[PDB]
Design a binder for this molecule. Structure first.
Ligand code: HEM
Length: 153
């Protein structure tokens, strides 16, 4: 369980993300695909992209990054009360996309890396610790929902 003060560190950096959600989404997905190339294989829509330049030029990937970060932002704004938001996302990612918990750890690492690079004004050690706690809570709750849904994760 996060404290209110931890939630405020999360939401304070997220407000900066929201100045340019599309650019942040590009950076985060590219970082994920570069650090853990196996994750790109999960995306039938994107797995043909060969280089960072093609990723950056892909209008479809940009759109998808907006979708992902807007969904995550709506979860974070719930400050842990995210049961309704998690249901549909857990179901699609367990049953259709088949995204293991290890890959949600990889995107969490990519989010942290980009925030650390872009926002050292709002992403010092305490803020990063709060964000990590929020992402760990998200992954814990997704893992619980995956088990309910029948997916090992
Ligand atoms: C912060 C974590 C994540 C969030 C909030 C998120 C959110 C979303 C949303 C909102 C969608 C569209 C609606 C849906 O299908 O549920 C989506 C689609 C998808 N996600 Fe995620 N996602 C996350 C992590 C991941 C990871 C780590 C992978 C793969 C390694 C992944 C793979 C996919 C795939 C394959 C699709 C379908 C894309 C398409 O063809 O349209 N997601 N995600």
């Amino acid at each position: 369980v996060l404290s209110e003060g931890e939630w405020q560190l999360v939401l304070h950096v997220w407000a900066k993300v929201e100045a340019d959600v599309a650019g942040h989404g590009q950076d985060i997905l590219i970082r994920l695909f570069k650090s853990h190339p196996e994750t790109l294989e999960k995306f039938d829509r994107f797995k043909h992209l060969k280089t960072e330049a093609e990723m950056k030029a892909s209008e479809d990937l940009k759109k998808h990054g907006v979708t992902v970060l807007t969904a995550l932002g709506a979860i974070l704004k719930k400050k842990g009360h995210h049961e309704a938001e998690l249901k549909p996302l857990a179901q699609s990612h367990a049953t259709k996309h088949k995204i293991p918990i290890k890959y949600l750890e990889f995107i969490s690492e990519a989010i942290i890396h980009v925030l650390h690079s872009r926002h050292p004004g709002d992403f010092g050690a305490d803020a990063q610790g709060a964000m990590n706690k929020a992402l760990e809570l998200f992954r814990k709750d997704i893992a619980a929902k995956y088990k309910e849904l029948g997916y090992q994760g």
